[PDB]
Structure 1
Amino acid sequence: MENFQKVEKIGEGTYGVVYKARNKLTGEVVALKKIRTEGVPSTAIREISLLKELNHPNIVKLLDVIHTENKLYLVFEFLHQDLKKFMDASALTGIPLPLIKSYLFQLLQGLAFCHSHRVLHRDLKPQNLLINTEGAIKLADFGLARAFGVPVRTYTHEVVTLWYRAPEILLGCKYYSTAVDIWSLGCIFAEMVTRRALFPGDSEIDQLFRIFRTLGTPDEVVWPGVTSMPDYKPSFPKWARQDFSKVVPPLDEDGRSLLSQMLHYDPNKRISAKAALAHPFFQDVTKPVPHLRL
């Protein structure tokens, strides 16, 4: 708008476009997200407005929500880089384990907070995790499907990333639980460690089968009720589970144990964010400073 002077486009999420902008008055630098649309829902505004009262050091602060002319603007505190860029920038040397551990620990604190407040992210991915020069990492772009449905595209027509989608979502479950966020974080954790996406599916079935090929095709023994899921097909190939040491080398056993609990098939067995914070893997967690080139 005119109260804001765009500085540059930051990207085009799954619900809109994000810009870096400065408040002509306050001089405050912010991230301005524009969402598209026959008037904009009212219940959505209420649910978004809710998110404004969510404050935690590991959640990007939502400063203002502005409804105007079918366009919905969200003003967020601005951070300088996202985890996708940082991972790309660290692909040659890898992110130091102590930083990986610090980032995972802070993300679980943010989720434990969201989850205890009945808030689900639903679309965690490297691009939605922001970092600063101080070593903090925060959850951003909370989806908002609980009040908007499942995104089929965008304004410029973009390819939705399925790499971090929990298996119950892929199998058609209609009700997501906090477990879907733990699954995504697990996938992200693995990616920071190996420097390659864990499950880089290029379609929904491919995403599902990449998961099956690595963790084994689920059955009623490991996931009671799985064969009754909406999109479960008795015809799915039955792959055997892969030794977990081949999945995320050279991650230590504490790390592999935690990841295995974040990646359990059964949403009910999957570790909670709170329980994960108590895992032995975090016994020596610290808060290192990342080498950020801005």
Structure 2
Amino acid sequence: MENFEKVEKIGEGTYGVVYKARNKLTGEVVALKKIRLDPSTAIREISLLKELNHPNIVKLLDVIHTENKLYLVFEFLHQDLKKFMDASALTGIPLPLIKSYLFQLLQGLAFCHSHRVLHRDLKPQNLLINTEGAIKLADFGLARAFGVTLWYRAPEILLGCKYYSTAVDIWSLGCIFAEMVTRRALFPGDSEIDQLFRIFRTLGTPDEVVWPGVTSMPDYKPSFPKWARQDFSKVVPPLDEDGRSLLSQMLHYDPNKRISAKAALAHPFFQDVTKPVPHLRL
């Protein structure tokens, strides 16, 4: 590369290959994302995301459009939440650290949402951690500009609603919360219908009482099986009553009923939040 002294593939991301790269002029290590194309609107829209700065969002440092190729340059972090959860599977992530991470992620969502930016595809691979106890969300705003792990997808998306709201991100974060606590994915579906039916088997099949308008969703079928709903006490033990209450508000079926990021920060579950230091093996 003409502007990067060295470049190493990290892995296959949601938009193309992601590289660890060293800027040739400055020496700075960045995450360089090559967008897999064959989009003038996307360039201007994403370029606006360069302006956003919060401690819990991965900075978009640059948008590079050269040689008819598109690259996004982001601030590099040394581990994602997926790998951290794997590394913590025998002990679990300590509760104070789960709580710190959830609090920080909600601050990042609240910031992004207040600026009219959604994620739409939050998942452990786009939640990145550092050695100082921070966690940051990567790739906020890209999905709208550009138009597969289904495990974190909100039910309205799975039911074919093409109108996204802030609530889709709260759903995904609720699923991630549950996974940090239990050390297993909450809804590890293998297809859209398996994903939907895993949700239904835990939370009950939605109906017009809990979710007015659900039966007019594009992909809703009156033939869906009708499962009863399970208690969160069975789903995320040993999470306490405060954590279970918050999770239940993040996982309401009706997106309009789900707690906002701002309201979630005020929940009693955060009546003793702290910022612990994680043990990261790099």
- TM-score scaled by structure 2? 0.98
Matched position secondary structure for 2:174: helix
What CA deviation, in whole Å up to 9, does each residue of 1:37-86 have, x standing for no partner?
Answer: 35xx1110111001100110000011110012332111111110000000
Residue in structure 2 matched with residue 5 of structure 1 by the alignment: 5
Contact 1:36/1:70, CA 8 A, preserved across alignment? no
- Structure 1 CA distance for aligned equivalents of residues 51 and 151 of structure 2: 30
More helix by share: 2
Structure 1 stretches of 4+ moved >3 Å? none
- Could you tell me which runs of 5 or more consecutive residues in structure 2 were left unpaired when the two chains were aligned: none
Matches of 1:11 and 1:143, distance apart in 2: 21
Q: Is the 8 A contact 2:242 2:268 kept in 1?
A: yes
Q: Which runs of 5+ in 1 are unaligned?
A: 150-159
Aligned mates of 1:83, 1:251 — CA distance in 2: 19
Contact conserved, 1:37 with 1:70, CA < 8 A, in 2?
A: no
What is the rounded CA distance, in whole Å, between the counterparts of 1:94 and 1:242 in structure 2? 24
Q: Alpha carbons of 1:143 and 1:87: their partners in 2 closer, same or farther (altered >3 Å)?
A: farther
Q: Distance in 2 between matches of 1:200 and 1:279?
A: 27
Q: Distance in 2 between matches of 1:90 and 1:239?
A: 33
* Equivalent-residue separation in structure 2 for 1:275 and 1:221 (angstroms): 24
**Contact 2:117 2:141 (C-alpha < 8 Å) held by counterparts:** no
Distance across 2 between alignment mates of 1:164 and 1:53 = 27
Q: Cα offset for 1:235?
A: 0.2
3-state SS of paired residue (1:145): helix
8 A Cα contact 1:58 1:110, kept in partner? yes
Aligned partner of 2:114 in structure 1 is 116
CA change 1:205–1:173 in 2 (3 A) is: same
Q: Which residue of 2 aligns with 1:219?
A: 207
SS for the counterpart of 1:240 is: coil
CA contact (8 A) 1:17 1:35 kept: yes
Query: In 2, distance between residues paired with 1:71 and 1:261?
Result: 42
Q: Match of 1:109, SS? A: helix
- Cα offset, 1:7, TM superposition: 4.1
TM-score by length of 1: 0.94
Q: Which moved more, 1:7-16 or 1:126-135?
A: 7-16
Identity %: 99
1:17 is aligned to: 17
Q: Aligned equivalents of 1:58 and 1:285: distance in 2?
A: 16
Q: How far, CA to CA, are the matches of 1:68 and 1:118 in structure 2?
A: 29
Kindly state the Cα deviation for residue 25 of structure 1 after the two structures are TM-superposed: 2.0
> Distance between the aligned counterparts of 1:145 and 1:277, measured in 2?
25
Q: 1:8 deviation in Å?
A: 2.0
RMSD across aligned C-alpha pairs, in angstroms? 0.9
C-alpha deviation, 1:24, in angstroms: 2.0
Following superposition, the deviation at residue 207 of structure 1 comes to: 0.1
Tell me, yes or no, if the aligned pair for 2:119 and 2:143 is still in contact at 8 Å.
no
Residue by residue over 1:125-174, the C-alpha shift from the partner in whole angstroms, topping out at 9 and shown as x without a partner, is: 0000000000000000236231222xxxxxxxxxx000000000000001
User: How many residue pairs end up in the alignment?
Assistant: 282
Q: Which residue of 2 aligns with 1:194?
A: 182
Which residue of structure 2 aligns with residue 43 of structure 1? Answer: 41
